[PDB]
């Protein structure tokens, strides 16, 4: 190819979900966590099993 016309393969690359950036992304305020409880805190949740 050329270094100014190179493009990735189709389906190879997605952009990642930045979470916690504004209302319209759907992951804005509470950031996919829901409101309260142990799962909504940083480092929270509980161990597998």
């Amino acid at each position: 190819m050329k270094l100014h016309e190179l493009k990735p393969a189709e389906g190879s690359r997605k952009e990642r979900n930045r979470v916690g950036r504004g209302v319209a992304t759907g992951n804005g305020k509470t950031s996919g966590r829901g409101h309260k409880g142990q799962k909504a805190r940083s480092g929270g949740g509980v161990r597998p099993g």
């Binding site: 190819m1 050329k2 270094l3 190179l6």
Partner: protein, 154 residues
């Protein structure tokens, strides 16, 4: 927070001053610092399977062949390094601004006579990679390097 200097002192007391709960002078909302998730020194390199490296290098110089940017010549015979002479070599045979000369073993006089022209790069046949093949507009391989890249890439 753990790396900025100072800030072990809790700056005021927890209840009863009328001000917000702050815990150190160096918390990340303070001006003095403490960065939350910034750069860490990491390594960005990764690897492919090594059948996928041969194929990426064959596809980079078949794109040169199919668009006729492959000019095989005989041996370069430079006794002394002379940039003025090598620039005339790239003009007697017509070449674009970016060119990539390739020899079999390391020719010390070609690699010095082309070292100063902007756009030209000298490479051993063993040292071909995808990013100077696809950067150049045209290859100029030799006889001894064309047979050498043919043996190791196939």
């Amino acid at each position: 927070r753990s790396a900025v200097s100072g800030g072990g002192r809790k700056p005021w007391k927890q209840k009863g001053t009328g001000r917000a709960r702050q815990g150190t002078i160096r918390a990340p909302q303070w001006r003095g610092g403490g960065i939350v998730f910034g750069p860490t020194p990491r390594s960005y390199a990764y690897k492919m399977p090594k059948k996928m490296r041969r194929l990426a290098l064959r596809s980079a110089l078949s794109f040169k062949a199919q668009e006729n940017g492959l000019t095989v010549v005989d041996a370069f015979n430079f006794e002394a390094p002379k940039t003025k002479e090598f620039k005339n070599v790239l003009s007697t045979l017509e070449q674009p601004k970016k060119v990539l000369v390739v020899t079999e073993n390391e020719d010390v006089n070609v690699e010095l006579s082309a070292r100063n022209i902007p756009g030209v790069q000298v490479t051993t046949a063993q040292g071909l990679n995808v990013l100077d093949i696809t950067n150049a507009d045209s290859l100029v391989i030799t006889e001894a390097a064309a047979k050498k890249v043919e043996e190791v890439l196939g």
